[PDB]
Design a protein around this nucleic acid. Structure first.
Ligand code: MG
Ligand code: MG
Ligand code: MG
Ligand code: MG
Ligand code: MG
Ligand code: MG
Ligand code: MG
Ligand code: MG
Ligand code: MG
Ligand code: MG
Ligand code: MG
Ligand code: MG
Ligand code: MG
Ligand code: MG
Ligand code: MG
Ligand code: MG
Ligand code: MG
Ligand code: MG
Ligand code: MG
Ligand code: MG
Ligand code: MG
Ligand code: MG
Ligand code: MG
Ligand code: MG
Ligand code: MG
Ligand code: MG
Ligand code: MG
Ligand code: MG
Ligand code: MG
Ligand code: MG
Lengths: 114, 363, 123
RNA sequence: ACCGAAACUAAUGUUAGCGGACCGGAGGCUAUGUUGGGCGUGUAGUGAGGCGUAACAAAUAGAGAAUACCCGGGUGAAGGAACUAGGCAAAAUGGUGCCGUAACUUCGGGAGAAGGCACGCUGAUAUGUAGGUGAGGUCCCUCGCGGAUGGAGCUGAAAUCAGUCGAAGAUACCAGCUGGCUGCAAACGCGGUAAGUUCGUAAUGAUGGCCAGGCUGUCUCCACCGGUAUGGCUGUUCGCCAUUUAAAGUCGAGCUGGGUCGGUCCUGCUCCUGGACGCAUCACUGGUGUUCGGGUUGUCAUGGCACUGCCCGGUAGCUAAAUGCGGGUGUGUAAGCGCAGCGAUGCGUUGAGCUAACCGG
């Protein structure tokens, strides 16, 4: 609907960078402790992107402290301070869920050199 | 060989004065056999109440305390871990040691100026750990390159090695420490020979003001990180340790009584390095000399005796090993024999710390 | 989203290697336990010389779940496996002295600030 | 003897499994296929066949007469047997080669024990190799349906190295679950669990009991196409036990069929916000999504078929575990052309092409 489109559009972030599944990205999020508020960095491979305007989300998977962690960020939420693509990956799927079965060597993603 | 903990850290943090006063704690090698002092090889002795408490009864002619060994890891630039000559030298100097002591400046001083200008233990710690982590990343990547082709050959041992290495790799890629992983004992066994740098235990040598031993935000952050990584800490003051190095016995006693210190923090660094590596010391009683002998924890009586002399190992038959409590409370060897608290220890029993022992061999 | 019979890995050095949830505490017919919930566990695997034995019954706090936790903005954080930190059955304090792997901010209550302080990374 | 084509279980009222063993198995020869272009004689071995009156293979892929092509199913978050009398059913395993294989043993076995690795395609070795077949020509000859040589041509593994594509190479269909303890029966010889009502003998068993790994919609709890426990044991009600809780107060023309070895049916907690339940919803997180896109195996003619063939994603809708009380989306760079490469293939055009139920007209 035009009404909901306008309501969502006036909320969408304007500076969302272009990234693709397989890209390694670093997502700077806001952590609020007590009253202070600081940046926490979540760097990992983008394994899934949901594109729905204001409801766009993307999944970032990392291996933190020997344990696989997937975080699903809401692209336009204020808690996500920034997104920076640290490496462009060359994959062919839109959703890289198969990396959930991969370990180390088999988990390398070729660098999209272009 | 000595059980060695390399002292690493960023420049302008107070490490220089620290290991200078540590070397000043070292004894002149003119009386100790086989003790050769390289300028950075710091062999330091044990202030041990137990040995003098033994000597109060056994009354030996001389005393031979055991000593530990230290490496000053000097010369450092950012980005050294990319294979630069100084970076390779730093990494090699760390590699040959057995533990890491990381020094952290925890005292505000505008006359001691750093490259950051801002006093922050967290980011300095992170910088040096990232350096070692990139070094271990290079080593580990070489390791999987070597081992994956073998494990594809059906070698189960190389398979397990591969599993441990693959679990280690993303930590190093994430610039993370292998000591932050839950690695079982056999995984440690599998990757012991690769000598992973981040894997060795570390002691956080926190250089602080004399009055700043508590209520210190820098100490707070150092304690927080050491708790997270399961590493131990030791707060020291460069000025206080330097003075202790610069003072003789009675004036040193006066200075330590002035500051309210029950015993100096150099002793704390000694104990931290000693107990960090899971090693202990026993005592041999004699009229000539009562000597404290350093072994790894769990080394047998034959193995400890071979550490003395190989005939004491190969020919070993039995030892009369006495617990230190029963040795002291009965006032010496003869009281021990009168109480029957001896142990006719064979070859399989594991040596306990501080046990008064007599060694019997046959060669 | 842990229930009875769920097998969790252990996120501390207490010696337990795998535990099993035998009860979800804190409510009649309560189905599940998410991160920050106390469960009653038995120990299915332990290292031979650990602080706890195979077959002991004690408590645990779930710190990582595959199902994950939601954040107020709608984010979700999911882990590859379910993990718990063993707790003294009475004091409900951690039995280990180190924590392995990341945890989440839902533990940051006065109950579990020890775990937060020992955790390698709080998400 | 073993595996496997040509009445043990469950569901329905045959189907899927099981035991023994759109259909299209409904040496020499030949049928026949693939690719290329009666009489006479009396042969290999009385006697096929041949000859007279092209080669090869040999009784699409595949070992094959299997298989595929010429309520009944699919998927499922987290968990993973908590279901239940009982893992019933389902899920799972599943091929070949190589390595490796325990107790015990009647020395055969156990055993395919278990467990591990590799697998596609392309190129090279080698313009098709080893091997098989074998023309011409040459020579011999008791001279023929002969012998030797010779290798043309045809067929042709298997392996190594290198490259290369996918998420996945035994890609589909097809195709062992495995292990431990024990009763009985073949001949033969003489503690475990948090909690547990459950004469020997290798092999064998649709045999009884128990345990474990894997696996799972069996279940929590199903989805899509006023309140008033959970479990272990047992047929149990009960009971004990484990652990919770505020509390565990004092019906088979609905199902099952275990009993009668086998046997027709509202409030907690914290400090000085939760549990359970109910309603609504789909914005978020997800499931489904046989109507969208893609990958891929076999085959037949990009499409059909193979469970949607197998899969990977996924729109709307529905939904709970979720949360209140022209464009967009999805897939993922179409086709064609061009370039590189010997080729598989890669790259450019190109985030292309296509895009359901959506949104705006
Ligand atoms: Mg037979
Ligand atoms: Mg019958
Ligand atoms: Mg019926
Ligand atoms: Mg049948
Ligand atoms: Mg049979
Ligand atoms: Mg058969
Ligand atoms: Mg023919
Ligand atoms: Mg057929
Ligand atoms: Mg199914
Ligand atoms: Mg499921
Ligand atoms: Mg699942
Ligand atoms: Mg499981
Ligand atoms: Mg049961
Ligand atoms: Mg039940
Ligand atoms: Mg069955
Ligand atoms: Mg099945
Ligand atoms: Mg019986
Ligand atoms: Mg029989
Ligand atoms: Mg059971
Ligand atoms: Mg009993
Ligand atoms: Mg039910
Ligand atoms: Mg009955
Ligand atoms: Mg009926
Ligand atoms: Mg919607
Ligand atoms: Mg989805
Ligand atoms: Mg689907
Ligand atoms: Mg057809
Ligand atoms: Mg069809
Ligand atoms: Mg057909
Ligand atoms: Mg296409």
């Amino acid at each position: 609907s035009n009404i909901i489109k306008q309501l969502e559009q006036e909320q969408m972030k304007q500076d969302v960078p272009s990234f693709r599944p397989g890209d390694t990205v670093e997502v700077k999020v806001w952590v609020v402790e007590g009253s202070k508020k600081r940046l926490q960095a979540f760097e990992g491979v983008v394994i899934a992107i949901r594109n729905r305007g204001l409801h766009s989300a993307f999944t970032v998977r990392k291996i933190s402290n020997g344990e696989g962690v997937e975080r699903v960020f809401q692209t336009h939420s204020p808690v996500v301070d920034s997104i920076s693509v640290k490496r462009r990956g060359a994959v062919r799927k839109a959703k890289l869920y198969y990396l959930r079965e991969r370990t180390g060597k088999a988990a390398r993603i070729k660098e999209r050199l272009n | 060989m000595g059980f060695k903990c390399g002292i690493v850290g960023l420049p302008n943090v107070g490490k220089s004065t620290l290991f200078n006063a540590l070397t000043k704690a070292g004894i002149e090698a003119a009386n100790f056999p086989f003790c050769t002092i390289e300028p950075n090889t710091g062999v330091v002795p044990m202030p041990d109440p137990r040995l003098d408490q033994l000597a109060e009864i056994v009354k030996p002619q001389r005393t031979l305390p055991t000593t530990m060994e230290f490496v000053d890891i000097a010369g450092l630039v950012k980005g050294a871990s990319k294979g630069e000559g100084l970076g390779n030298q730093f990494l090699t100097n760390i590699r040959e040691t057995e533990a890491i002591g990381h020094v952290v400046r925890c005292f505000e001083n505008d006359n001691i100026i750093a490259v950051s200008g801002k006093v922050n233990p967290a980011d300095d710690i992170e910088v040096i750990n990232t350096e070692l982590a990139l070094a271990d990343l290079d080593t580990c990547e070489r390791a999987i390159h070597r081992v994956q082709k073998k494990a594809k050959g059906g070698d189960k041992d190389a398979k397990a090695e591969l599993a441990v290495l693959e679990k280690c790799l993303p930590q190093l890629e994430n610039a993370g420490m292998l000591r932050a992983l839950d690695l079982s004992a056999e995984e440690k066994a599998a990757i012991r020979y690769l000598s992973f740098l981040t894997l060795k235990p570390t002691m956080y040598i926190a250089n602080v003001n004399e009055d700043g031993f508590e209520n210190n935000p820098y100490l707070d952050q150092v304690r927080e990180i050491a708790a997270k990584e399961g590493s131990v800490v030791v707060p020291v003051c460069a000025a206080v340790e330097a003075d202790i190095a610069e003072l003789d016995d009675e004036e040193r006693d006066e200075f330590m009584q002035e500051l309210g210190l029950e015993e100096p923090g150099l002793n704390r660094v000694i104990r931290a390095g000693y107990k960090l590596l899971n090693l202990q010391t026993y005592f041999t009683a004699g009229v000539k000399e009562v000597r404290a002998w350093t072994i790894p924890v769990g080394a047998t009586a034959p193995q400890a005796a071979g550490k003395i002399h190989t005939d004491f190992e190969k020919g070993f038959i039995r030892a009369q090993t006495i617990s230190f409590e029963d040795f002291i409370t009965y006032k010496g060897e003869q009281g021990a024999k009168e109480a029957g608290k001896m142990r006719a220890e064979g070859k399989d029993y594991i040596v306990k710390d501080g046990d008064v022992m007599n060694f019997l061999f046959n060669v | 989203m842990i229930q009875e019979q769920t097998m969790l890995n252990v996120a501390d050095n207490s010696g337990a290697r795998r535990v099993m949830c035998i009860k979800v505490l804190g409510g009649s017919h309560r189905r599940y336990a998410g991160v920050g919930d106390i469960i009653k566990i038995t120990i299915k695997e332990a290292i031979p010389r650990g602080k706890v034995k195979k077959g002991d019954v004690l408590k645990a706090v779930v710190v990582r779940t595959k199902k994950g936790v939601r954040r107020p903005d709608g984010s979700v954080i999911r882990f590859d496996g379910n993990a718990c930190v063993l707790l003294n059955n009475n004091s409900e304090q951690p039995i280990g002295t180190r924590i392995f792997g990341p945890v989440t901010r839902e533990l940051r209550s006065e109950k579990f600030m020890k775990i937060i302080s020992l955790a390698p990374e709080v998400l």
